């Protein structure tokens, strides 16, 4: 699943980054 | 066959030899650092037959050869076999001659100085290279990944280095050089496959196991859970076909081997694992450094290509690390071969053309010159 290997990296990175942003956006107060 | 005096770039490790020319984005060819020799008495006349075979020749004729690797966990000791590996790499693959090109080789930051001196001596005295430059693998690993700041996790066949770099500067007191590597995993797998009824002790058997590892192994995000199911059901087993037609079915050994990276005690090593060395190399750095290093743990070298390895280390580092702060592993597809790419990047920088040892300075000073000229 080559399509997945890369889509997997894309989504894990994009969600982790988006989540890191969600958490910081609130956490910064 | 090149139309410019581009530097040659080569990573001559304990595993593979990667080579190409500066300015490319990949080695042109990769083969094992092997020089093989017959372990049998010849009986037929007019059979040709070499005293020694190199690289792919050594593997192709291996049925009657004992195979040796000149580089021992990152250092060159058998320089004569390496002269043969370099000659093969340059002339029978890249079709270049060092005499017409400056050459860049690389080593870990805490690699014994003897390695850099011997590599310099041979390229200048037996290949007549016009210039030399021994690069740091950590420098090259971050160039290839695109960082000036981060931890180099170069977990390949020889040694794991674990070095923090900040804004292009070394933070050397925090380097955790560790005697845990892909080479130990091959031998450990031979021993746990012996437990399953398939003993492996010879060179051919070692090359078979290295192939099993490279094709079947992974680490997994949760070891104990993966272990519990692999140890209980055939659903996590994978077969491997041996060169002679035998088939080996492998279960939890498929990950128990690689898990040694997180649990070094499996091979008798006094270590907390690669995730703790990464963690401590950051924790020993100042707090205005740590915020950038935890977010940039960077993979290079082999074993970093195992499924679950970036997630496994990020999870453990995150568990050990403080909250609020973000912890991340950078693990690009240009894995295992990224240090070569970094070599191309360094070799081709305009800011690097003053860093070369020329074959003038070399003869006036001798090979010890590398210790003062490169870094």
């Amino acid at each position: 699943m080559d399509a997945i290997k890369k889509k997997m990296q894309m989504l894990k990175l994009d969600k982790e980054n988006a989540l890191d942003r969600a958490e910081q956006a609130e956490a910064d107060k | 066959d090149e139309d410019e005096t581009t530097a040659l770039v080569c990573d001559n490790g304990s595993g593979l030899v990667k080579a190409g020319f500066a300015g490319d984005d990949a080695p042109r060819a990769v083969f094992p650092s092997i020089v093989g020799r017959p372990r049998h008495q010849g009986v037929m006349v007019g059979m040709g037959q070499k005293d020694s075979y190199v690289g792919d020749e050594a593997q192709s004729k291996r049925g009657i050869l004992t195979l040796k690797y000149p580089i021992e966990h990152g250092i060159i000791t058998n320089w004569d076999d390496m002269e043969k590996i370099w000659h093969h790499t340059f002339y029978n693959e890249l079709r270049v001659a060092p005499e017409e090109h400056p050459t860049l080789l690389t080593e870990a930051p805490l690699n014994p100085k003897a390695n850099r001196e011997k590599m310099t001596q041979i390229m200048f005295e037996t290949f007549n290279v016009p210039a030399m430059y021994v690069a740091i693998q950590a420098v090259l690993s971050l160039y290839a990944s695109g960082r000036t700041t981060g931890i180099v996790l170069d977990s390949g066949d020889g040694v794991t280095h674990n070095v923090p770099i900040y804004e292009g500067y070394a933070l050397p007191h925090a380097i955790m050089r560790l005697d845990l590597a892909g080479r130990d995993l091959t031998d450990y797998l031979m021993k746990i496959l012996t437990e399953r009824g398939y003993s492996f002790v010879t060179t051919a058997e070692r090359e078979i196991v290295r192939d099993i590892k490279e094709k079947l192994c992974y680490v997994a995000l949760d070891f104990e859970n993966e272990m519990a199911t692999a140890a209980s059901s055939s659903s996590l087993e994978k077969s491997y076909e041996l060169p002679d037609g035998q088939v080996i079915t492998i279960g939890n050994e498929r990950f128990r081997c690689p898990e040694t990276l997180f649990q070094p005690s499996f091979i008798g090593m006094e270590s907390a694992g690669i995730h703790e060395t990464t963690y401590n190399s950051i924790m020993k750095c100042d707090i205005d450094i740590r915020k950038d290093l935890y977010a940039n743990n960077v993979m290079s070298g082999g074993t970093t290509m195992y499924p679950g390895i970036a997630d496994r280390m990020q999870k453990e580092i995150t568990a050990l690390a403080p909250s609020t702060m973000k912890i991340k592993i950078i693990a690009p597809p240009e894995r295992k071969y990224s240090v070569w790419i970094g070599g191309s990047i360094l070799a081709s920088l305009s800011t690097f053309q003053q860093m070369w040892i020329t074959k003038q300075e070399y003869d006036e000073a001798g090979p010890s010159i590398v210790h003062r000229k490169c870094f």
Partner: protein, 57 residues
Amino acid sequence: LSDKLKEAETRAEFAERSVTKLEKSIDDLEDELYAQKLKYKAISEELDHALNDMTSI
């Protein structure tokens, strides 16, 4: 008997030449078979494993 022999030798040699070709066809066929099995095995297994490890997306 000489003509029968030449014919029998023709048949034995014809067939020997033909069996040689058939033996070659088998050697090639088995290599093709192995390729089918090996590629099939590799594909079915690379997917069972790719999907078993690549489950989180």
